[PDB]
PDB file of C-alpha atoms in Angstrom:
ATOM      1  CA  UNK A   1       7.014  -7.802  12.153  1.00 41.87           C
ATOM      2  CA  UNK A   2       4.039  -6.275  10.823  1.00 39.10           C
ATOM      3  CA  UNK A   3       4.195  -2.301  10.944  1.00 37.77           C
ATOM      4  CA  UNK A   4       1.434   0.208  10.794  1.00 39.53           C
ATOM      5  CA  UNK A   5       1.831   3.202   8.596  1.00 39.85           C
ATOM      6  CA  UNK A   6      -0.522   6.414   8.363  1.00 44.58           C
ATOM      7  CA  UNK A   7      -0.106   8.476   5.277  1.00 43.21           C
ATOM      8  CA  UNK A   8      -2.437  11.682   5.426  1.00 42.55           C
ATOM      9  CA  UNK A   9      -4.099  12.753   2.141  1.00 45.33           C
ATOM     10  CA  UNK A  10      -2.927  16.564   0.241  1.00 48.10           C
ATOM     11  CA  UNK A  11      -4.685  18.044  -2.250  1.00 50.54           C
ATOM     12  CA  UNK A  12      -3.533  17.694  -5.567  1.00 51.92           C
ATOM     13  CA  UNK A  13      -0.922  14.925  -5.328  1.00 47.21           C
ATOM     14  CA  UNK A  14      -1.089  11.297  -4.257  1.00 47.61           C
ATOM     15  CA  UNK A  15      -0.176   8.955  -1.710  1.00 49.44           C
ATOM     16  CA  UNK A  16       3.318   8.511  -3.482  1.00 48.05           C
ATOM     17  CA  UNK A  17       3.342   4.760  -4.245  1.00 49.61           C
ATOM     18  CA  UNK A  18       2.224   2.274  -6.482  1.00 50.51           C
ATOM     19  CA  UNK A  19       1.648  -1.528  -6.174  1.00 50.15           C
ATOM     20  CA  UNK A  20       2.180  -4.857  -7.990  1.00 49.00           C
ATOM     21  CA  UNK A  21       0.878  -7.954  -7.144  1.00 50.61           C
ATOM     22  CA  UNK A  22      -2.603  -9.622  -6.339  1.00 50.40           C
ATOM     23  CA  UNK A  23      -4.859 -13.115  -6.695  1.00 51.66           C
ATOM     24  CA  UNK A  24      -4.611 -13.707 -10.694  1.00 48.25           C
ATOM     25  CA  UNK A  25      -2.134 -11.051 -11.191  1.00 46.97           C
ATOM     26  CA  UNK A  26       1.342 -12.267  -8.820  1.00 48.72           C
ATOM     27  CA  UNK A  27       4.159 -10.321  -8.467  1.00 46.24           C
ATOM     28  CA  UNK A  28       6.029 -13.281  -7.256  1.00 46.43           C
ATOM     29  CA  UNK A  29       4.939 -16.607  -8.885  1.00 41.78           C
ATOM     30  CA  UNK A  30       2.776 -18.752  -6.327  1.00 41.13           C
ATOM     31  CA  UNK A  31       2.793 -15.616  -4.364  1.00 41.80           C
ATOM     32  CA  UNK A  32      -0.827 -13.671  -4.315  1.00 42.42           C
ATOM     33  CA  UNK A  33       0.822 -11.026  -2.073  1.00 40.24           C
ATOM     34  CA  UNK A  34       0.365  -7.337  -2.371  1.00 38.56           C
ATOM     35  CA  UNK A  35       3.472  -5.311  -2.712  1.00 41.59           C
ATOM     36  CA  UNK A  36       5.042  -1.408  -2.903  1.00 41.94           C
ATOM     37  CA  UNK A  37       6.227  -1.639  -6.325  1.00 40.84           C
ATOM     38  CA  UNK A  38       7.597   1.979  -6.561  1.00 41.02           C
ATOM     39  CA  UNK A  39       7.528   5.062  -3.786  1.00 42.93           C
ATOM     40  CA  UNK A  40       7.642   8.157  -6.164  1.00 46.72           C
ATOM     41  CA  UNK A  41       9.706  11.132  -4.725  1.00 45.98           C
ATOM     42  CA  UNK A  42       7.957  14.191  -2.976  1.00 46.47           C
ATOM     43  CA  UNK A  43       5.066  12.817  -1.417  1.00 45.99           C
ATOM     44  CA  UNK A  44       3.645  11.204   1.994  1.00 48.17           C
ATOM     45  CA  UNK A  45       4.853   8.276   1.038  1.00 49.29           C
ATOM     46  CA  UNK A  46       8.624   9.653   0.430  1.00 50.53           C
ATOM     47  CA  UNK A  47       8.785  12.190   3.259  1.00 50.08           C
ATOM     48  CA  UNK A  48       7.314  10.100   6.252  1.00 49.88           C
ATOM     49  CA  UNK A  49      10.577   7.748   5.103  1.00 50.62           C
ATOM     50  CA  UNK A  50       8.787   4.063   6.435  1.00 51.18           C
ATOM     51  CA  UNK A  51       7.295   2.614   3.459  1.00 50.46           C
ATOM     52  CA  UNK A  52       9.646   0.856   1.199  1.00 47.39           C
ATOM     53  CA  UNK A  53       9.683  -0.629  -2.309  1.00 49.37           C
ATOM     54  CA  UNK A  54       8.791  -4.537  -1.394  1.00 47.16           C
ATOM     55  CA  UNK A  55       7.038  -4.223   1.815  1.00 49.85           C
ATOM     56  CA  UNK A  56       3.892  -6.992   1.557  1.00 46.89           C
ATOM     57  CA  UNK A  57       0.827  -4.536   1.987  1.00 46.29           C
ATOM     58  CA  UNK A  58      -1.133  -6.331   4.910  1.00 44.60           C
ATOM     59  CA  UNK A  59      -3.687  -4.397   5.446  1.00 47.08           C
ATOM     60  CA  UNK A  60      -5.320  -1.129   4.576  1.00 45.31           C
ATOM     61  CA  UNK A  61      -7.939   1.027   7.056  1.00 45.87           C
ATOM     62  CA  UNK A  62      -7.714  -2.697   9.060  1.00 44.56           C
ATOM     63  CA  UNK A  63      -9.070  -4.896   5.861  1.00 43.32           C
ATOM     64  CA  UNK A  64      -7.131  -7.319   4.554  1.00 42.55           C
ATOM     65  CA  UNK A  65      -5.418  -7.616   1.101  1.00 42.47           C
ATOM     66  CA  UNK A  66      -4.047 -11.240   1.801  1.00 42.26           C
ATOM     67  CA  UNK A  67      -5.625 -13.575  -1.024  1.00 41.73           C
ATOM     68  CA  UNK A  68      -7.227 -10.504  -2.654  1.00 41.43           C
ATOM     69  CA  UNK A  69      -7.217  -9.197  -6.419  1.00 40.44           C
ATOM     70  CA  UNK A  70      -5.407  -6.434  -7.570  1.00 40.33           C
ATOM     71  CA  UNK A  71      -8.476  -4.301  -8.363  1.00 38.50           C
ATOM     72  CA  UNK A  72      -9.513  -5.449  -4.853  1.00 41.10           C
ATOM     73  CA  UNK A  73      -6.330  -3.659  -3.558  1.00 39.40           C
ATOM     74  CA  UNK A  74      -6.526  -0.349  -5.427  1.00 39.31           C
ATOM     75  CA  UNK A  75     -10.346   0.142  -4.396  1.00 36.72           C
ATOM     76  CA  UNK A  76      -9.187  -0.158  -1.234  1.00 35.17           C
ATOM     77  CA  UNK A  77      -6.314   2.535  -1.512  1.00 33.37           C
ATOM     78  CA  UNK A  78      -8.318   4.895  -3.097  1.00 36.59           C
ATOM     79  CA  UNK A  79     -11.150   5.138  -0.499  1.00 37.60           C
ATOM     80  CA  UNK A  80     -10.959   8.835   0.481  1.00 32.97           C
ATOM     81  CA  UNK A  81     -10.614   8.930   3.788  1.00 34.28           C
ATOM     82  CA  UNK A  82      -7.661  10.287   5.421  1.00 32.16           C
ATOM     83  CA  UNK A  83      -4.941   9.089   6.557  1.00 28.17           C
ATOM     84  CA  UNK A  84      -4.571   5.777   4.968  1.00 29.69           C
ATOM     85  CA  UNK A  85      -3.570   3.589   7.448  1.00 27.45           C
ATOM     86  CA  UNK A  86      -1.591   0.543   6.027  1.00 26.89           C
ATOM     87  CA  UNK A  87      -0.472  -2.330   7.954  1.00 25.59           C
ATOM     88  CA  UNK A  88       3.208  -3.545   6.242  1.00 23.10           C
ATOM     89  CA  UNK A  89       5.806  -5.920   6.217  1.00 20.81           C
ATOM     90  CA  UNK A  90       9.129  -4.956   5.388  1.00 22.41           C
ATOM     91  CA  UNK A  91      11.666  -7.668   3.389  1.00 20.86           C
TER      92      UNK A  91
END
């Protein structure tokens, strides 16, 4: 089921993940689906534990990334505000 996830901001490092995927740029062929690609160690990401490499991103601050680009995605994950609140699926 689809689980929500808030990751609070630091200054000077990042959220601790990165993502593959995207409408003209599939991880997964015939799959448009945003992904966690990697969580990189000591970080939000790492320490709050849920995220995990393969969840399908749902959703981020409540706006979709279902049928979206890649570049789509990433504006969307570096909007400022804190936390970034993503809406998963885990495989």
């Amino acid at each position: 089921g689809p689980e929500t996830i808030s990751l609070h901001r630091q200054h000077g490092r990042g959220l601790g993940f990165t993502i593959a995927g995207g409408q003209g740029s599939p991880h997964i062929a015939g799959d448009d689906g945003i992904f966690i690609s990697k969580i990189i160690p000591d970080s939000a990401a790492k320490e709050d534990g849920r995220l995990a490499v393969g969840d399908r991103v749902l959703s981020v601050q409540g706006e979709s990334c279902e049928k979206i680009t890649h570049e789509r995605a990433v504006e969307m994950l570096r909007n400022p505000a804190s936390p970034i609140v993503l809406v998963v699926e885990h495989n």
